[PDB]
Amino acid sequence: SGFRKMAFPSGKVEGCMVQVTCGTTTLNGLWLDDVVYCPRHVICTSEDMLNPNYEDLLIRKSNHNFLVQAGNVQLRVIGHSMQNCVLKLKVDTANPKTPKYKFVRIQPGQTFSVLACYNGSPSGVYQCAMRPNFTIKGSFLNGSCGSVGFNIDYDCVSFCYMHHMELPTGVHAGTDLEGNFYGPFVDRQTAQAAGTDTTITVNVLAWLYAAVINGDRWFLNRFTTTLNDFNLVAMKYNYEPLTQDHVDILGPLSAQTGIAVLDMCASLKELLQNGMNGRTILGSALLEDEFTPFDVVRQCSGVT
Amino acid sequence: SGFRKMAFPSGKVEGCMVQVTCGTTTLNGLWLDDVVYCPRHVICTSEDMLNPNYEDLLIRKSNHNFLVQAGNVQLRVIGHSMQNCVLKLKVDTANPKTPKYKFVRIQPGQTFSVLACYNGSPSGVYQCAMRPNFTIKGSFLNGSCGSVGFNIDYDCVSFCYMHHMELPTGVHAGTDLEGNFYGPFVDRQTAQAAGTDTTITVNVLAWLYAAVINGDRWFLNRFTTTLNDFNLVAMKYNYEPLTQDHVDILGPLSAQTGIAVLDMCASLKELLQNGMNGRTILGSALLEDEFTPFDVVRQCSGVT
Ligand SMILES: *CC(=O)N1CCC[C@@H](c2nc3ccccc3s2)C1
Ligand SMILES: *CC(=O)N1CCC[C@@H](c2nc3ccccc3s2)C1
Known part of the structure; x- marks a missing residue:
């Protein structure tokens, strides 16, 4: 008896969280196989946080400009691409703790667990839903970007969410793991109003x-x-x-x-x-x- | 921004959870170093769930009567003792994933995370407090006994709670990891009324x-x-x-x-x-x- 707001155990996703640094910007990445997924706004230099052209910004970046740290060991980046609003960093090492995983885009009303992370270190786990206005009522400080939402089916992690944005009303906007935002949100420091919750x-x-x-x-x-x-x-x-x-x-x-x-x-x-x-x-x-x-x-x- | 009921990441405690079977009774154990901690009522044969004398019940049990399963591999039990309301099973193998840990008795008002488990497999994680009447408002089905409450300080797991009891009012009573019940509760199927919450x-x-x-x-x-x-x-x-x-x-x-x-x-x-x-x-x-x-x-x- 008793009913509790319950998250999936975080163990399998803890084993995937890394630190990604581009210049002076740090946030969290997700290391699955030999790819590290992170929000592309890692490349924004504390100045172009208003009207970034990510394609142009990216031309200036190289494999060696992305610093990937798993525990206190650095991963070697041997390639990088943009898919929608995420970066995929090819590393030379497969994550030895890569669980069985899918990437799935959830619908509004669907619930998932968030492993909130800072500098690739997990700090806590909470249960969320994707709201009908495609926001989530998260808990996320600065450096929490790249923190992921997931469901677990037995031993398979379905990754549904990556954290990108706080709207001025203190709700949260993010992407699926193909880097497509849930709802009309953009990785831009601009007046973005959520609809009716x-x-x-x-x-x-x-x-x-x-x-x-x-x-x-x-x-x-x-x-x-x-x-x-x-x-x-x-x-x-x-x-x-x-x-x-x-x-x-x-x-x-x-x-x-x-x-x-x-x-x-x-x-x-x-x-x-x-x-x-x-x-x-x-x-x-x-x-x-x-x-x-x-x-x-x-x-x-x-x-x- | 946003404030959420947040549990510690469960990874470090997931790596400690095993299945303990005595006769036909199964519940969860906690494997730290070469010891497995479990509720002593694992020895109750679906009949003596009313007025057990645990000392006498235990005389009839041997090392080989306790079946300990970590993943799908069995651990060899080379000793067993009763400390208050828990059993300590000495196994011949140290848990390779044993984190830095303490055992701590918390006070009422203190919050902790619970990794709810079934047959040594973790199903979910929620945030709890020890209530002023020394109950917890948990979520726990049959087979959830031995599920543990914990706090994490960086890389040290302070284990504060082990699950034993549902009171007839559907609240939860348990022990610290020395097997002393929080509050006046006993591992006995008897009218036990919690005080003022x-x-x-x-x-x-x-x-x-x-x-x-x-x-x-x-x-x-x-x-x-x-x-x-x-x-x-x-x-x-x-x-x-x-x-x-x-x-x-x-x-x-x-x-x-x-x-x-x-x-x-x-x-x-x-x-x-x-x-x-x-x-x-x-x-x-x-x-x-x-x-x-x-x-x-x-x-x-x-x-x-
Ligand atoms: C969410 C988080 O932890 N972040 C830290 C790294 C930079 C930060 C950015 N926010 C924005 C918003 C709009 C445009 C660009 C950026 S970088 C994300
Ligand atoms: C809580 C749980 O999962 N359990 C399953 C194994 C047996 C069960 C018992 N409950 C009681 C209550 C009073 C006396 C003895 C027992 S065994 C615990």
Whole structure:
């Protein structure tokens, strides 16, 4: 029993984190096989942080201008390229701790763990979601760039995120590991406004199921609703629309708890319409939207 | 910017987790040097889970009755003893991944990371506090026993907790790594009621400082108070008393933010007396008490 905001063990990703220095700029890299992935803004000289032309900036850089340090040993860079907003540094040594890995672009609502790093040294691990406005509400100081988000499937690390940006509102923008930004964000020191941070309705429902499963049931009402009706209420409260895909994905939680998805929808509707009245659900005064259905099943079944 | 409930990287503790089987009972062990630490209730045969005499139960056990599996290789047990509520199994092989480690008994209010494990395989990592009633609000299924709580100081793992018990109210009781339970709990299937789960006042204050530091300032009031006055209010709201030690420990946060500790006390008092009025602080509708002052400084300074 008990439900916790839980990250994947970080061990496999700790073994991949290196320091990358270009001139006086230092941030974190990801060493997989003989390639080190890092944000290309490592090449920005504390001056061109406004309107960089990365192609032109890069012409001035050589293999030997990129300093890669894994523990307290330097890696030899034998090649470098730009793919979108990342640099791939070819090193002469394969990372001996390279786990089974993929690179995957996640959708909004998807949760992942972040290993926050400084000078290639990991400092902490937290659980995140990709927000519907393609930001993440991270924790990231200066030098945290190149820190990565990931999911683990048994022994395979799916890398979904690399850290690049803090928006002036203190939320976070980053790329997949092909260096394509999630959302409309650019690696440029420019007014960039995030859109509406809507609540991930499907994740709230999974977490309401997680609560029932752990004994917190006070919010279970006598009512049901329809997808159309529920969705009028969602719209009003800045909740993402519920699709038949969301209902299908919740099936197993529905099954295990014997609460129809649409019944749980009607419970959510009342909690939105009436608030918590000073009560809590799994020790929270608001509705948590950063556990997926897949996350709840994992933590309510002890998957490793 | 951004403040997150952050665990230590789990890598160093992942490398210590093994499976321990006695008869048909399996749970997790901690392999440091040539010793495997596990909860002694590994010896309870799905029947004596009510009134075990561990000394007598243990007479019937031999070195070869304890099956220790590290990855998919078995360790040879060359000795076994009981220290309080843990077993120490001497194996013939030193753990090659044994980090620098201590064993430390923490005080209530102290935070630590838990690597939740099943059959010696780690499934997730979360941040905890030792509650003033000496419980922890964990997430733990069957087979999670022997999962450990820890702090990391640079490269030294201070192990503070080993998991043993779920109380009938779904909170968690465990031992330090000398096998002494935190609080009055016993490794026995018996009515055990936890006491009053009070709020860790010092941790709430640190987290209010963390908020100021991250831009959430709406709750900063025009008032101050005294330790005595504030403590009348704390008492009424089931908050732990604030000592001069707590004030001293908050000094540096006070310094960095230029908000006197007692001024922040008066802000807390108003939030207790008036509630949140539907607002949030660092994306929370209640007052978080599971970040220590030491935790805030770490995450608001990028320590690795
Ligand atoms: C996020 C981090 O740790 N960084 C440290 C190295 C330089 C820094 C940059 N931020 C920007 C923003 C816009 C353009 C260029 C750069 S470099 C990233
Ligand atoms: C917590 C866990 O994973 N366990 C699995 C192995 C046996 C189980 C026990 N619980 C109790 C409680 C009271 C007395 C004896 C035992 S064995 C622990």
